[PDB]
Amino acid sequence: GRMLLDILKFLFIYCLVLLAFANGLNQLYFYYETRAIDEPNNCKGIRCEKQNNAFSTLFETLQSLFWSVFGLLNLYVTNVKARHEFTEFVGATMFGTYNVISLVVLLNMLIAMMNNSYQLIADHADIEWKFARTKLWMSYFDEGGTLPPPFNI
Amino acid sequence: RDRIPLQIVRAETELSAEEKAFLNAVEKGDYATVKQALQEAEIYYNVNINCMDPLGRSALLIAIENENLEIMELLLNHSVYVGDALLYAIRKEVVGAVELLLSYRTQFSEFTPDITPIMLAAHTNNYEIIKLLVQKRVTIPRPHQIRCNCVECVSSSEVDSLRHSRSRLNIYKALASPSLIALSSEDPILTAFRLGWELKELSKVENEFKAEYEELSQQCKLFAKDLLDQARSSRELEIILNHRDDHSEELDPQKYHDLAKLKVAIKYHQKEFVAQPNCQQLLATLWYDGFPGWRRKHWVVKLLTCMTIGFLFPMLSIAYLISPRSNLGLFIKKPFIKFICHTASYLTFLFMLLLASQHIVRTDLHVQGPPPTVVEWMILPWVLGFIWGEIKEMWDGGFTEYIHDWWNLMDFAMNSLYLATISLKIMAYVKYNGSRPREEWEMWHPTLIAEALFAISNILSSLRLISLFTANSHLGPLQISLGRMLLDILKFLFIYCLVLLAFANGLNQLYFYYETRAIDEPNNCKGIRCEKQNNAFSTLFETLQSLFWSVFGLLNLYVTNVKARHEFTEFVGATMFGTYNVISLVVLLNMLIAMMNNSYQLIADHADIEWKFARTKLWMSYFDEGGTLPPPFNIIPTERNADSLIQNQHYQEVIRNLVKRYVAAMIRNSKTHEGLTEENFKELKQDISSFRYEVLDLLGNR
Amino acid sequence: NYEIIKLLVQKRVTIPRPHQIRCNCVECVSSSEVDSLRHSRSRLNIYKALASPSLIALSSEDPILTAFRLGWELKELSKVENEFKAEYEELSQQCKLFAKDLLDQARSSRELEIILNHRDDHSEELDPQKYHDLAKLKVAIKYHQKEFVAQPN
Amino acid sequence: RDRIPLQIVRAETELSAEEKAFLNAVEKGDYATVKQALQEAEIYYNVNINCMDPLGRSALLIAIENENLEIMELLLNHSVYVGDALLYAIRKEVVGAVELLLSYRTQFSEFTPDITPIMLAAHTNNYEIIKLLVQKRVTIPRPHQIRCNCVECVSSSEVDSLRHSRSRLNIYKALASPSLIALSSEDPILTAFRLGWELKELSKVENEFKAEYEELSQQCKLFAKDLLDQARSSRELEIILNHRDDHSEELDPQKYHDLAKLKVAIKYHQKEFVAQPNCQQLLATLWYDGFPGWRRKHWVVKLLTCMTIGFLFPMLSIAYLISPRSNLGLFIKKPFIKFICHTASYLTFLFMLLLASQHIVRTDLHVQGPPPTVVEWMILPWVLGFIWGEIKEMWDGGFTEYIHDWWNLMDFAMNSLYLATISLKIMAYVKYNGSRPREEWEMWHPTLIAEALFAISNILSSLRLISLFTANSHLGPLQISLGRMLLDILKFLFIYCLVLLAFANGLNQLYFYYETRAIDEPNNCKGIRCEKQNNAFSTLFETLQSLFWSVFGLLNLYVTNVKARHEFTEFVGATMFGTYNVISLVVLLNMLIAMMNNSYQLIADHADIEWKFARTKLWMSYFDEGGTLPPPFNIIPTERNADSLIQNQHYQEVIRNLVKRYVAAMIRNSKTHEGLTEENFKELKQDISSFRYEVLDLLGNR
Amino acid sequence: EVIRNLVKRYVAAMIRNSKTHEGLTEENFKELKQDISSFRYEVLDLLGNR
Ligand SMILES: Cn1c(=O)n(CCCO)c(=O)c2c1nc(OC1CC(C)(C)N(O)C(C)(C)C1)n2Cc1ccc(Cl)cc1
Ligand SMILES: Cn1c(=O)n(CCCO)c(=O)c2c1nc(OC1CC(C)(C)N(O)C(C)(C)C1)n2Cc1ccc(Cl)cc1
Ligand SMILES: Cn1c(=O)n(CCCO)c(=O)c2c1nc(OC1CC(C)(C)N(O)C(C)(C)C1)n2Cc1ccc(Cl)cc1
Ligand SMILES: CC(C)CCC[C@@H](C)[C@H]1CC[C@H]2[C@@H]3CC=C4C[C@@H](OC(=O)CCC(=O)O)CC[C@]4(C)[C@H]3CC[C@]12C
Ligand SMILES: CC(C)CCC[C@@H](C)[C@H]1CC[C@H]2[C@@H]3CC=C4C[C@@H](OC(=O)CCC(=O)O)CC[C@]4(C)[C@H]3CC[C@]12C
Ligand SMILES: [Ca+2]
Ligand SMILES: [Ca+2]
């Protein structure tokens, strides 16, 4: 729980990166949005068996970039029906650049910072835990909440 | 053959037994015995007063070694050979012995031939001894510039490179001595700034002795920081930081005009000097000019204040034009208020970038040369201000310094892409006059290119916001540390680049025979971006992309199969792909993690000073009154030596007090810092021995 | 130095009382106007004297309570006065150590019971539903005296 | 109210001015002044000889403080109050003062009431002072057992828990003193073994003071190791390591019967003692009995030699059965030779496991009750030997000690699975007497269960080989360190298990409404192991598997959709899955990496000593005569007081010399180990002051 | 009463803990040297047959 405060700071930089690339990808792909009736099985989005419309809207784009962190977004979502070769390559390069920044650079930077921060936290773990356990114990010394929730009403 | 006989291989001349006892008396402190032996040496001529043990230490060196001044005079009175005794006395740091040797008037030495009494005294950093020598009109050779091709510099390195390098380092060790700088430097702070900067550059040219020069440079930086630590009042700090070394060159208006010495420290990269708490405290007062109690305010009132100022940025900008001298027109000039207004004027620009794709008009997807939309028109004035502001710096700051900042590279690319989008949009508007279905557009249609260029600029514009993390106490230190880790990562990418090319060449060499046509692929799609990936290694360009995507696991294994089903070829190609995965994902990826962890540990101990230096540069960029208006509004159209002489007199008085306090503190800090050594124990023992012999001498008839 | 401090205290000496951290009085504002550097250094010098374990042991009616409050006040000061945060954090740590070291000198369970159950003249009304004892231990928890609470005894 | 008035809150009784000067004379070393003041106080009664300085130090304590023995006798001769002076003299460690106080023989004290002169002397670990007190018939209280419920232990704990805990720790600090053990222990090595082991157990029960007891235990382990370091010949080392503390055991002919003290050290976990280089060197000589020059041989001849003996294991085992006394029948008894034969006999078993699936007989996949094949028949004797060997440890080693070793848990599971396979195979052979297509077999067909159980045993059998890495110098240290990291990882899996259950419950609670039938799924396949994954969160059991597989990225995103296409439900379920991925893969996974990196750094400190201890246990298991035959061949069917007294006499003589050498070394190591303190500077200053005053008594003129 | 005893024990321990600091400085060497010099001068001042 002491390592979570440091992790939260790093999540500020990643959010800026996610928004920067989400805006760029949506700005490029929103022209080619298709309708659900025109998709196989009538399913629209990235939660379909055949993912589509990954970057059609900003809300959808943010989810697509989130899921690519875990490798659940297929590469073929960067293609459009009209097969505009230059547009598809540019969109795939934005997606590729985002993957490098988030998974090769930012992910490892968080690991390095976590390792350094855990070393400092580890030398005060005993005193910190004992203080926490003392608060836990003292909350049961009082005779106010003796009855558990089932019987306290 | 079963025993190793040991003998003296390089034998020196042996010392007589009479001399052995004579030297033992000097070590014991036996003044009476030494005096008599000297008396005998004047008549008998049996013992050699100038006798030296193979170690080279004569009686004079032994007398200096024990700090026994009374005996040393005894030997000096007897005309003993001096030679290099002054250097030994200076090294021992015995003020009494140095004065005696100064008042007095193929051998082996412990010092190189280039060492002089003044240079060695500066190496020891002894204020008292350095003052004694400087009072006797001493000088030190001036080292030539680092990149010098004169006859002396070239010839000296030709005759003896080893001696030439050592002589130069000895001179710089003396010049970098804090005691010498405090004593002989007219402006010790400026001297430490320039000397430390020069040493850092020398540590790069002199690859072999980089560590030595880097320690001297660090020593100069510490001295300037420690001098500033001795300031005792705000008036003293103001005098030091606002001092201008020269006044002849005219100072152009529109600039801050103050903190001249602080700006010099920033130019020389004096991070410790800039990060000094008293210097930082003064800067915060100027930065928060309109908020006397900013630090005392709750984090909620601070946030509420920021939003109110930001939403009012359009109104404050208008006031600065309509009535610059009015009460409202002066708020924008406060550095922190101006910073919020610029940030607000940039957040509005980024918000409109989102609105570019949030609004869609049906039937407008097919206009080949569409004119600017509503959002584009509002964005246009912002872009012109951004381009105008960047050119305003190229003609003002200079080409050289601009490119050094990495954030300026992103500003140049962002503005170039925005200019290309506008020109491309104009060509499409003129070349086409109707609407055609987008499916029939060519690959390089101008409208398609403009849309791609515009989208790339949007990513760069959003990423620019990260530079604002420097202003925050929580995010700034982390953001600065992250940028320091990127240079180490860039070196690692060199090894991975060669690995990627090596395997890309091998895989393409194996698979290019089996390239197929798009007409023969399902859905008529060729490449790895299709639903059914194919032709992964058909061409070198495609192969490089396939290996890049496999780093993230987005390349399926079945791409290693060919239609003809050549079993041996497919297995070899899959083994190349497998070997590449092992090298890049199991070995190289983990090596980068290990290297990053080690490098972050070192960076973490200097994060505070590095961030404060970065934030100081951010603050100072808003002190000037040049770029007050944010981008949206920045395009709308007898004898005067008395002041300089007095300003210099006050600076000299403050410098005099700072040196006095610093010298006392350093003399104080030595007596309570380090423990004893054998030299102290030997000296204490000799004191008792000398006292014992002298007391025993007062006796009767023997 | 305990011996020297006793000599001076016996001669009717006094120390200036520092104003609260968030003070807007004429003296605090005016002094910070004429000389901010001297004002900051003067305040730190006073707190260095007040945080001295020897002075607290000699002149404090309740040294344990004084160390609790003084150390807590210094921790808050290290936030407002961020330029000299390290100096104030070291003083706060020094106060925490003194209270813990005083508790280390207890030689019997009766002595420990007396110290930990002491009420600083509360009077007032105590809730029967609450826990009556360990008044000083609860004060230590309130001031975040983790080393004091984690003491083995 | 703007000033804090400082006053003495707890004021003590003031000391008169006459007493203040009297104490100053003692500190100065002024013997003459002290003598007059004491003599004057015998008549005038103006000064108090026992003047209690508020600090509690009287003149006697000041005299002891400066080690001024002559003055000490001056005050003692005057009948000054002694009180607790002996403890102060003992703490100062001044032998002269201690003898003086011993010879003649509520106030504030610096010592708790339980401290006695002998206990405090042992705390200081001063051999000379401890000998003086022990010679005067002193005793120390015996601490009760760790878990004692007697009236005294319970009453003391309730009466004063704080004092009871402190008293017990003080006693153990005295008993753990190396000087006291060397002086008063009949068998110092055995005493250090038991005392250190007892302290380690106490550090767990008394968890509040765990660090204190762990340091005492480490101190006992070091003392035994340091005693062994003083051995100067192989004969001395042999006597120490082969000493039997007690007799009448009658031993066991199957047992090794030698290295009795080494076995005791292993039992008490004396890793440093076992890892001593001289102890290790002796063990290697026994381990390599048949190879006098094993270390001098090239790594190729070693490897070539190992294969030769390994391939010859079948006939070496036969020779030991036919002619045990023959030349060839004695080779198998050498520990290293026996280890290779057992390893070879196990590698053969693993090779046959591979052959189980390498031979496939067409038309034999449908026999319901098939009999054992060729490979199975050969494997059978190996399995019976393995089961027989493990049961042989039940009756020999005992139930309790077997379960301690984690490798025995894998041996038990492996043998149980093999037994279940044999019984299941027998039932199928008897129940079914024909052939039937395997497609119609039921889910729980006995033949199918036997095949699964057999395959699981094969994995466990192969993993057993990892335990052989301990014998290698390169792999053993790493394998041991890896096993030490598994206990820290197991704690982490507790937090992940809670997270997995929390999200599994939430996801199943949301998706169980939309469960579909296998008939309605494509290919009639239901679950996440189908080509088109479905019903991922239909049941709790399925949900747990789905979340497990998503850790490796094997669960597709489309499993979050339901047939009815309830948009809000699908988004909520996908957000639960997304939140779980963040917590487990971005947060918890990295936290484990950080924890592992920190724990591995500490483990690497003791890798060598830990591996050597593990390898010693491996070697000793082959010294015995019991399990000589590998599993394949292991199933085929007066008065000694005089000899024990001499063995004890030799041990005592060696122990006497080891203590003498150890005591001198420790007395030697102190005079060069630690630097000077303030007490040394004060002592030196007082010496000069005393000399100055004494000399000044004889004033020739004034 | 308890506070009084705790302070007495604490003060003694801190005064004790400094004398065993295990360190020396130049100011101690200077003081020790000066003691011998002062003693030497005082003894020498009482000269005999001049
Ligand atoms: C960001 N990025 C990307 O988006 N794609 C997908 C494009 C659309 O499919 C790529 O293929 C792509 C790419 N960075 C690429 O190389 C970089 C990769 C990283 C890890 C940053 N290091 O280490 C260096 C050494 C700088 C090489 N490559 C592969 C590539 C290289 C040359 C050529 Cl000519 C073609 C492809
Ligand atoms: C590079 N490489 C590869 O390309 N393939 C794909 C071939 C085409 O499908 C493989 O299967 C393949 C492979 N390295 C393999 O083992 C290595 C893996 C690493 C991580 C380098 N360590 O740890 C060692 C211990 C050296 C084993 N194996 C598996 C394998 C092993 C034996 C046999 Cl007989 C067959 C396969
Ligand atoms: C848990 N989680 C998730 O389940 N999904 C899938 C939903 C169903 O598809 C998401 O898309 C999703 C998500 N956390 C998201 O951002 C998080 C990412 C992390 C690194 C955890 N940091 O630190 C914070 C600051 C908490 C933001 N995003 C992306 C997103 C963002 C905004 C919007 Cl409006 C829409 C999506
Ligand atoms: C509307 C879309 C385009 C997103 C806009 C971006 C904002 C969500 C964030 C991203 C980074 C933020 C900035 C990050 C850092 C700072 C420095 C911060 O500095 C201070 O004045 C506080 C210093 C301190 O308290 O130590 C003020 C807010 C600001 C400009 C933040 C303002 C809000 C920003 C621009
Ligand atoms: C699944 C099976 C069929 C394949 C694996 C078996 C062998 C390829 C390897 C795996 C581990 C090896 C063992 C690992 C460690 C050792 C200890 C090693 O010890 C020594 O005698 C050398 C000590 C040193 O030189 O320091 C001797 C070989 C041996 C038994 C090795 C023998 C060969 C083994 C069994
Ligand atoms: Ca710029
Ligand atoms: Ca076993």
Concatenated DSSP letters for C19-83? Answer: PPSS---HHHHHHHHH-HHHHHHHHHHHHHHHT-HHHHHHH-SSHHHHHHHHHHHHHHHHHHSGG
Residue nearest atom 9 of ligand 2, based on CA coordinates:
B574
Is D678 annotated as a binding-site member?
A: no
Q: Which of B553, B597, B675 sits opposite D675 (nearest CB)?
A: B675
* Helix%, strand%, coil% for chain B, nearest 5: 70, 0, 30
Confirm whether residue D393 is marked as ligand binding.
Answer: yes
Q: D594 to chain A: nearest residue by CA? A: A115
Judge: D557–A110 Cβ closer than 8 Å, yes or no.
Answer: no
Candidate from D465, D469, D473, D612 with most ligand 5 atoms within 8 A of CB, to mutate? D465
The span from the CA of D70 to the CA of D245, in Å, is 49
CA B511 to chain CA centroid, Å, is 50
Using CB atoms within 10 A of its CB, is residue D240 exposed (0-12), middle (13-18) or buried (19+)?
Answer: buried
- Neighbouring residues of B634: CB distance < 8 A, sequence distance ≥ 6: B385, B388, B389, B627
CA distances from B147 to B143, B144, B153, B192, B199 (A): 11, 8, 10, 21, 13
Nearest CA in chain D to A117: D594
Q: Which residues of B define the annotated binding site for Zn(2+)?
A: 144, 148, 150, 153
Contact by Cβ (8 Å): C128, C144: no
Q: Which ligand 4 atom sits closest to the C-alpha of B475?
A: 15
**Cβ(D125)–Cβ(D177) below 8 Å:** yes
Q: Which residue has tokens 């875990």?
A: A70
Which residues are within 8 A (CB) of D83 and not within 5 positions of it... i.e. 6 or more apart? D107, D109
- D620 residue type, one letter: M
Element (H, E) at D456: helix D446-463
Binding residues of C for Zn(2+): 19, 23, 25, 28
Give backbone dihedrals phi and psi of D282, rounded to 5 degrees, phi first: -65, -40
Angle at B429 between CA B428 and CA B430, to 5 degrees: 90
Ligand 3 neighbours, Cβ below 6 Å, are A 11, 14-15, 59, 62-63, 66; D 571, 574-575, 578-579, 582
- Amino acid identity of residue B153, one-letter, is C
Distances (CA, A) of B566 to B108, B555, B556: 81, 21, 19
Of B313, B301, B304, B315, whose CA–CA distance to B337 is shortest? B313
Residue (of B658, B655, B666, B653) closest to B230 by Cα position: B658
State if residue B155 touches ligand 2 by the CB under 6 angstroms criterion. no
Q: For residues B672 and D546, give the distance between their C-alpha atoms in angstroms, rounded to a whole number.
A: 67
What Rg, from alpha-carbon coordinates, does chain B have?
38
CA distance A17 to chain B (A): 7
Q: By CB neighbour count within 10 A (0-12 exposed, 13-18 middle, 19+ buried), where does D238 fall?
A: middle
Can you tell me whether residue C15 is helix, strand or coil? strand
Cα–Cα nearest to B103, from B132, B61, B83: B132
Question: How close E41 comes to chain D (CA, Å)?
Answer: 11
Q: Which of D602, D596, D604 is nearest to D490 (CA)?
A: D596
D623, D256 contact by CB (below 8 A):
yes
Nearby residues for ligand 7 (ion, Cβ within 5 Å): D 408, 411
Q: List CB contacts of B115: < 8 A, sequence separation 6 or more.
A: B87, B170
Cα dist from D434 to C60, D366, D430, D443, D452, whole Å: 98, 9, 11, 19, 21
Give phi and psi for B149, each to the nearest 5: -120, 20
Contact: C150, A127; criterion CB under 8 Å: yes
Phi-psi region of B109 (alpha: psi -120 to 50; beta: other; left: phi over 0): beta
What would the DSSP string read from start to end of D55-88? TS--HHHHHHHTT-HHHHHHHHTTT---TTHHHH
Cβ neighbours for B457, distance < 8 A, ≥ 6 positions apart: B414, B417, B418, B421
In sequence order, what are the residues at sequence separation of 6 or more whose Cβ sits closer than 8 angstroms to the Cβ of residue D357? Answer: none
Q: Which residues of B sit within 8 Å Cβ distance of E?
A: 670-676, 680, 683-684, 687-688, 691, 694-695, 698
Of the candidates C140, C100, C134, C144, the one whose C-alpha atom is nearest the C-alpha of residue C114 is C134
For residue D591, give the amino acid letter. M
Q: Which ligand is nearest to the CA of A73?
A: 3
CA-CA distance, B387 to B457, in Å (whole number)? 13
On whether the CB atoms of residues D54 and D32 are closer than 8 A, the answer is no
Question: How far does the centroid of ligand 1 lie from the alpha carbon of residue A92, in Å?
Answer: 11
Tokens 């009855």 map to which residue?
A: A147
Please give the Cα distance from A130 to C147 (Å, whole number): 9
Q: Please list the alpha-helical segments (H only) found in D105-209.
A: 117-124, 127-134, 151-159, 161-175, 178-184, 188-205
Does D349 sit in the ligand 5 pocket, CB within 6 Å?
A: no
Q: Which among A47, A51, A122 has the least Cβ separation from residue D560? A: A47
Q: Which atom of ligand 3 is nearest to the CA of D575?
A: 4
Ligand nearest to C-alpha D469:
5
How was this model experimentally determined?
cryo-EM
Q: Which of E5, E9, E10 to mutate to test the interface with C (most CBs of C within 10 A)?
A: E10
E2 min Cα distance to partner chain B (Å): 37
Question: Contact partners of C by the rule of 3+ C-beta pairs under 8 A?
Answer: A, B, D, E
Helix, strand, coil content of chain C in percent (nearest 5): 65, 0, 35
Across the interface, do A72 and D556 touch by the CB < 8 Å criterion?
yes
Q: Is B557 in the pocket of ligand 2 (CB under 6 A)?
A: no
Please name every residue paired with D435 in a beta bridge, in sequence order, or none if there are none.
Answer: D367
Report d(CA D474, CA D466) in Å as an integer: 13
Residues B291, B3: Cα–Cα separation, whole Å: 87
- Our CA dihedral for D135, D141, D144, D150, rounded to 10 degrees, sits at 140
* Alpha carbon of E21: minimum distance to chain C alpha carbons (Å): 15
What is d(CA D590, CA D271) in angstroms, rounded to the nearest whole number? Answer: 34
d(CA B548, CA B546): 5
Contacting D with CB below 8 Å, chain A residues are 3-4, 7, 43, 46-49, 51, 66-67, 69-73, 110-111, 114-115, 117-119, 122
Task: Among the bound ligands, name the one nearest to the CA of residue D341.
Answer: 5
**Nearest neighbour of D9 by CB, restricted to C61, C108, C111:** C61
Q: CB-hemisphere CA count at 13 Å for D321?
A: 14
CA distance D631 to D635: 7
> Which residue's CA lies nearest to atom 34 of ligand 3?
A59
The experimental resolution of this structure, in angstroms, equals 2.3
Q: Which two tokens stand for residue D24?
A: 């100053």
User: b/e map of D248-259 (b: 16 or more CB within 10 Å)?
Assistant: eeeeeeeebeeb
- Pocket perturbation via mutation, ligand 1, pick of B489, B548, B588 by most ligand atoms within 8 A of CB: B548
D492 with D592: CB under 8 angstroms? yes
Ligand 5 neighbourhood includes D471 CB (under 6 angstroms): yes
Residues with CB under 6 A from ligand 4: A 16; B 343, 347, 350-351, 465, 468-469, 471-473
Quick one: tokens of D605? 């400190």
> How big is chain A by its Cα radius of gyration, in Å?
24
Tokens 């190793």 sit on residue: B4
Is the CB of B556 within 6 Å of ligand 2? no
CA distance B123 to B117: 10
State whether the beta carbon of D465 lies less than 6 angstroms from ligand 5. Answer: yes
Contact: chain E with chain A (3+ CB pairs below 8 Å): no
Q: Any binding-site annotation on D561? A: no
Q: Which two tokens stand for residue A33?
A: 């949005």
Most A CBs within 10 Å, among C103, C130, C133, C149, to test the A interface? C149
Instruction: Identify the contact set of chain B against chain D, taking CB-CB distances under 8 A.
Output: 553, 597, 675-676
Our CA-based measurement puts residue E23 at a distance from the nearest CA of chain B, in whole angstroms, of 6
Query: What is the number of the ligand 2 atom nearest to the C-alpha of B576?
Result: 4
Give the chain B residue whose CA is nearest to the CA of D681. B676
Q: Distance from the CA of B386 to the center of ligand 6, in angstroms? A: 9
Neighbours of C111 (CB within 10 A): 21
Distance from CA of A130 to the nearest CA of C (A): 6
The token pair at D49 is 């000889």
Instruction: State the Cα–Cα distance between residues B636 and B629, nearest whole angstrom.
Output: 10
The size of the C-D interface in CB pairs under 8 A is 52
**Contact across the interface for E26 and B698, Cβ inside 8 Å:** no
With touching defined as 3 or more inter-chain CB pairs under 8 Å, the answer for chains A and C is yes
- The alpha helices in D230-364, defined as continuous H runs, are 234-241, 260-267, 271-274, 277-287, 299-311, 313-322, 335-358
Q: Which of B346, B408, B423, B452 is CA-nearest to residue A24? A: B452
